[PDB]
Structures are given as structure tokens and as C-alpha cells.
């Protein structure tokens, strides 16, 4: 189906102690593949996936050069916003940026995006047309006018339609053995008595990729997902994901309940019940 290349920047000021802490992380779909952390004597862009290790020194030097320059602009940006908002230097502040491209199965662009924050709130965002900006407050309006004058939207449009899509295709081919093959969930129903009268039935989905999944419960062939407790999809730690959904049932009535699992890896959606 659809695929994405995405980057996430975070900068956190450190009052009275030196330069801001800057973190950059890159993702292809749900898989992280690059990192940068400013907290090192000589920090570099680094691999976080086996399939990107192949890239030569040229690649790593260019990414490192770009990320280090970005870290410096984020440092000046934090200082600039202290002036815009008339805020004390003594208090810590933070700025985030996330951007990326979503493509169709054949490789063609579906959408490009870019957004900036300040202290956990929307600051400025590139519009859908990739030609204009939406500013969230009067400080962001200063930035907006500045970026309009500089022709910033054109550079983003060039990157998102060009470099972003092209390199995503390269990444997908480089790691086709992992990125392009869906990993089906291992599924089971477990039983946990609460008392002689009540019992918890928990439906497990383990070790799946990608993260998107649907867990639903039925009773007597009727939907009762509204009664279930569903945990947020969580990382297993090895690049796969986990999720469960549980219902409290009357003891003796467990055969009336069915858990249904839908995931991209499954040729057929599975329905399970307590054995």
C-alpha cells in the first residue's frame, strides 16, 4: 500500500549551561533508520536500520553536514522566539519540526507535509498546496512574512516532490526484505478468573508489522467491542508491535465470545475463542 519517509526534530534549550540539546530521528513507515543527537564531542548522523548501513561516506557526511547546520538554526530560532514572546532566558523552551512525504504503491507522491511548534503548540505549518503558510499567532506571523520573502515554500515543495519521494523509493528497495514484507501477528486468547462468577478473556496480538491492526470482540455473533478494554499499540523492542483487547465475562459463558483480528500480513482475517 502507501509508504512514507518522515523526519522528527526536537530542540530543548538549556539555560545557563550551553547550546540546546537537539535530536533528529528519521523513519521509513514505522521503521526508524537514522538518528542524530547533539550530545557528543563530535556528533554524526548514524544508522538505526541494517539496510541503510550500505550507504557510503559521501551519504553520511552530507546528512551530518545538513543536520549539524539544522541544529544551529534551531539554536538561533530558540533565541529569536525569546525576543518574539518577550520571555526570560532563564526558563527552558522547546521547538519541534516534523515533515515528510506519503507515496502510492507505484512510487508517485500522494501528499507532502511540514509543521513547526513552540512549547507544545502549533507555531507555523506549510499548507497542503506547498506554496503557502498558516501562522498560529502574531509571533508566527513574523516568521510567515520572513519565509514568504525568502521563498521558503518553494524549497520545501522542491524537496518534498523531488528528493523525498526519490530517496524513499531507494530506501524501500534497499530494505525490501524487511520493509515490504508484512509480519502477521501471533494471536491467542487467555483466561484470567476474577472470582467464581467473573472471568477476564484477553485477546493477544504479538510480533506484528506494520503497527496498524484491528482487534474486535463479538458475543453471540454480535459486536461488543464497546465493552472491551483496548491498550494502545506498543513496540515490542525488536521492531515489531503488540496489542490486546480484553472483556469481563460471566464464568461458564466464555464459548459465546469471539475475538476477531485483521492485519495486513494475514491472507485471511482470524477469529479466535477460548479453548
Amino acid at each position: 500500500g502507501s509508504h512514507s519517509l518522515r523526519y522528527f526534530y526536537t530542540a530543548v534549550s538549556r539555560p545557563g549551561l550551553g547550546e540546546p540539546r537537539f535530536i533528529a530521528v528519521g523513519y521509513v513507515d514505522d521503521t526508524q533508520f537514522v538518528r542524530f543527537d547533539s550530545d557528543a564531542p563530535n556528533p554524526r548522523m548514524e544508522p538505526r536500520a541494517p539496510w541503510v548501513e550500505q550507504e557510503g561516506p559521501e551519504y553520511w557526511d552530507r546528512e551530518t553536514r545538513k543536520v549539524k547546520n539544522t541544529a544551529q538554526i534551531f539554536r538561533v530560532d530558540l533565541n529569536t522566539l525569546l525576543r518574539y514572546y518577550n520571555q526570560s532566558e532563564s526558563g527552558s523552551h522547546n521547538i519541534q519540526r516534523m515533515y515528510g512525504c506519503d507515496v502510492e504503491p507505484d512510487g508517485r507522491l500522494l501528499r507532502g507535509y511540514n509543521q513547526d511548534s513552540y512549547d507544545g503548540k502549533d507555531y507555523i505549518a506549510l499548507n497542503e498546496d506547498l506554496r503557502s503558510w498558516t501562522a498560529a499567532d502574531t509571533a508566527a506571523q513574523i516568521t510567515g512574512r520572513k519565509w514568504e520573502e525568502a521563498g521558503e515554500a518553494e524549497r520545501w515543495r522542491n524537496y518534498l516532490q523531488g528528493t523525498c519521494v526519490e530517496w524513499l523509493a531507494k530506501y524501500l528497495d534497499m530494505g525490501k526484505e524487511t520493509l515490504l514484507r508484512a509480519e502477521s501477528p501471533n494471536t491467542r486468547v487467555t483466561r484470567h478468573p476474577i472470582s467464581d462468577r467473573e472471568v477476564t478473556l484477553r485477546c493477544w496480538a504479538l510480533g506484528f508489522y506494520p503497527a496498524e491492526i484491528t482487534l474486535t470482540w463479538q458475543r453471540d455473533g454480535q459486536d461488543h467491542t464497546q465493552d472491551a478494554e483496548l491498550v494502545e499499540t506498543r513496540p515490542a523492542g525488536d521492531g515489531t508491535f503488540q496489542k490486546w483487547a480484553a472483556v469481563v465475562v460471566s464464568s461458564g459463558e466464555e464459548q459465546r465470545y469471539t475475538c476477531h483480528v485483521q492485519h495486513e500480513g494475514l491472507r485471511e482475517p482470524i477469529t479466535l475463542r477460548w479453548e
Binding site: 546528512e63 547546520n69 538554526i73 515533515y99 513547526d116 520572513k146 524549497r155 528528493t163
Partner: peptide, 9 residues
């Protein structure tokens, strides 16, 4: 590949 360094806010 990332985008190149942005213009200041």
C-alpha cells in the same frame, strides 16, 4: 535524505 537547513524563524 533530510531537507537542507531552513531559514531562521
Amino acid at each position: 535524505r533530510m531537507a537542507n537547513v531552513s531559514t531562521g524563524r
